[PDB]
Amino acid sequence: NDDDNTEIIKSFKNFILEFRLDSQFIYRDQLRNNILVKNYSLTVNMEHLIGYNEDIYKKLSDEPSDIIPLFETAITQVAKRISILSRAQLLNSLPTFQLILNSNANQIPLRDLDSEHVSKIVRLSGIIISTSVLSSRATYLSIMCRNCRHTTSITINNFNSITGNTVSLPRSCLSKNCGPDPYIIIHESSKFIDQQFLKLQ
């Protein structure tokens, strides 16, 4: 189970560290310039990914929502590798890097979307009619108990691939005779990101 995830992360790390045309490793310099300006994000062109290897593109096209977090954590692993000195052993305030994709595939009209486009990567065009106000989303939650009263941390990603995707509270305590879910949320010492809604016509 975990071995396949490590293999995929290693494959993406090899791709990002190895991709060079002529005499430049473009993605590594892109990471350097992004980190220097406090823009923890990376842009992947799909044609380069296809040309490097086809199996990774096939896997990304098959199950995008599962695969993407592995890539977006390989990116932050490589960034911490090529930006921070170990010094024979801190701040480490580097969140998970955002992945941005570009492609040149055929466009699909809005009315042509049907049941066969579920959980697939699509490209389309439209007009923006309204923008919602921004809201907060938790990423690293500090969870505290009441009876046994210990500390725990929950790491949650933004991709779901399903309706639920949510581990609300673990059943039973971590090992006396506590309740089913005797936990609360410590709002301080927590990390939050921003989300927005849009309407397309």
Partner: protein
């Protein structure tokens, strides 16, 4: 023959002995513009002479007037001249008023002419020492009889010998113009004999040999096995170079456009299925439905098209294409891969090169057009190197646009039935229409004519007649007329291929011009393309009808 294939190296050595200098340019090359084979040969020679640090200059020319003017411009310091892609069919000494005694000292200069056209000037062979050429293996065997007559022609009953010599000379002449070998092939044979072959040379030779697939398929089939054997003789790290023999098809930019557009714009499938009317489109949709590829899937780019059907395309074609007579589309081609940039094929490369030649960037505007053509040739030459790909993507998109325009004009011609069928030859004139300004290019006109010839040949008619095509340019008020030979269907056996169809249009044009005072201008290197006046076309045509072809 003057220079046999085995003697090439010797001549090459002479060039060094006459051109290797420290601070003097002693070699000048004239190339046949608007020709892919000439460009390939020029690139190979340029690399060769850059290897040994021999200083040189490259000068493209368009017409015989430019050739004569530039030859007049030259100085006596230039010991060696190269004339690649033309000059075989005429006697240069008469054209260039070359005095052998002015250039005797012997070998004051050297002029190496290297051309492919099989019929040429026999006096240029057997008369003059100063002019010298590289034979492809034709004089040694075919010309065994004509040389005796020429040597003998160089007591009252001796007139029989003179009559026989004149008859032999006439029989040797009155032959249509043809091409039987490749300049790039000859240069690569020389390189193989010398010992400087490599992958760049092989790629250029492949381009030069595959540029003839459209018109000289017999020559292409004769030359293919040598290329196959030579490429046999010679982890995806970012610096691998792969040259492989992968199956390919007679399709228009298959790996850069959608499969649907490829099947739609492929000339052979167009001819075989009559795509200009609605029944062709119905049969194409039948093809797709029976193969099983979804239409919306087949209308996607080749990069993003489904991997499973990409893998199974060969089997799908092999199982589906037999019913409808398209099984001749499958062939074997060369694929070049370098790094992570992708894969390309020789056919796509030559299509991109031709399109970039076509589109890029009275007497005064004619000169401006010829200068723009020279600049386009230079741009196409610069696009050859692997360090530039924005000069090849543009060529590919221009090829797509030009093929679209050609298809749009051809369907209109076919539906309006402007093809007039005479007793001897078919005639078609483009009096009016859209985008007529594009057809001022001879290669664009030849592409249009090739498509029309394919469409006419893929019919039930049992008459092989030459086709005459004309255009208009309103600024000049002249007709650009090109003569075209008939072609056999590509799916035919070699038994009925004793000799390629000859072209008598140049002979007919020159005879009519020599007997009437028409205001024409025959200066193109291709002798079957002339410029005629709008007012003078019709009587001229009548003469062509009433003259012996």
């Amino acid at each position: 023959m003057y220079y046999g294939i085995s003697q090439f190296s010797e001549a090459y050595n002479k060039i060094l002995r006459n051109s290797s200098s420290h601070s003097s340019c002693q070699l000048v090359i004239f190339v046949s513009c608007l020709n892919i084979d000439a460009l390939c040969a020029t690139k190979m020679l340029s690399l060769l002479f850059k290897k040994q640090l021999v200083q040189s200059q490259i000068v493209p020319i368009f017409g015989y007037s430019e050739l004569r003017r530039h030859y007049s411009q030259l100085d006596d310091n230039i010991n060696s001249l190269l004339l690649v892609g033309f000059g075989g069919v005429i006697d240069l000494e008469a054209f260039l008023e070359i005095d052998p005694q002015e250039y005797v000292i012997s070998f004051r200069r050297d002029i190496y002419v290297l051309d492919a056209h099989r019929p040429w000037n026999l006096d240029n062979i057997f008369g003059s020492q100063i002019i010298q050429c590289f034979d492809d293996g034709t004089v040694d065997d075919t010309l065994g009889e004509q040389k005796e007559a020429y040597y003998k022609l160089l007591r009252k009953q001796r007139k029989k010998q003179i009559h026989e010599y004149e008859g032999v000379l006439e029989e040797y002449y009155s032959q249509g113009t043809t091409v039987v070998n490749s300049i790039s092939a000859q240069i690569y044979s020389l390189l193989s004999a010398i010992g400087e072959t490599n992958l760049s040379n092989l790629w250029l030779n492949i381009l030069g040999t595959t540029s003839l697939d459209i018109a000289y398929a017999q020559v292409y089939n004769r030359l293919y096995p040598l290329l196959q054997d030579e490429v046999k003789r010679l982890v995806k790290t970012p610096d691998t170079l792969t040259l492989n023999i992968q199956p390919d098809y007679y399709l228009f930019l298959l790996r850069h456009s959608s499969l649907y557009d490829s099947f739609y714009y492929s000339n052979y499938v167009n001819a075989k299925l009559s795509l200009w009317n609605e029944n062709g489109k119905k049969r194409l949709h039948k093809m797709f439905a029976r193969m099983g590829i979804p239409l919306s899937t087949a209308q996607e780019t080749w990069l993003y098209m489904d991997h499973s059907i990409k893998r199974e395309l060969g089997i799908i074609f092999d199982k589906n294409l037999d019913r409808y007579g398209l099984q001749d589309i499958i062939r074997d081609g060369f694929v070049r891969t370098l790094g992570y940039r992708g894969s390309i094929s020789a056919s796509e490369f030559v299509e991109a090169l031709t399109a970039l030649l076509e589109v890029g960037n009275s007497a005064q505007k004619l000169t401006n057009l010829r200068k723009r053509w020279v600049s386009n040739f230079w741009l196409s030459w610069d696009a050859l190197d692997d360090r530039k790909v924005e000069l090849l993507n543009r060529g590919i998109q221009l090829a797509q646009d030009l093929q679209r325009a050609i298809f749009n004009t051809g369907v209109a011609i076919l539906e309006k039935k402007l093809i007039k069928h005479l007793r001897i030859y078919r005639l078609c004139v483009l009096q009016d229409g859209p985008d007529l300004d594009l057809y001022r290019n001879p290669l664009t006109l030849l592409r249009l004519g090739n498509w029309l010839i394919e469409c006419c040949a893929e019919s039930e008619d049992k008459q092989l007649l030459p086709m005459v095509l004309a255009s208009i340019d309103e600024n000049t008020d002249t007709y650009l007329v090109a003569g075209l030979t008939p072609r056999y269907p590509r799916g035919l056996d070699t038994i009925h291929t004793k000799k390629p169809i000859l072209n008598n249009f140049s002979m007919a044009f020159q005879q009519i011009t020599a007997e009437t005072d028409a205001k024409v201008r025959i200066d193109n290197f291709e002798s079957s393309i002339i410029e005629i006046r709008r007012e003078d076309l019709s009587p001229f045509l009548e003469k062509l009808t009433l003259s012996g072809l």
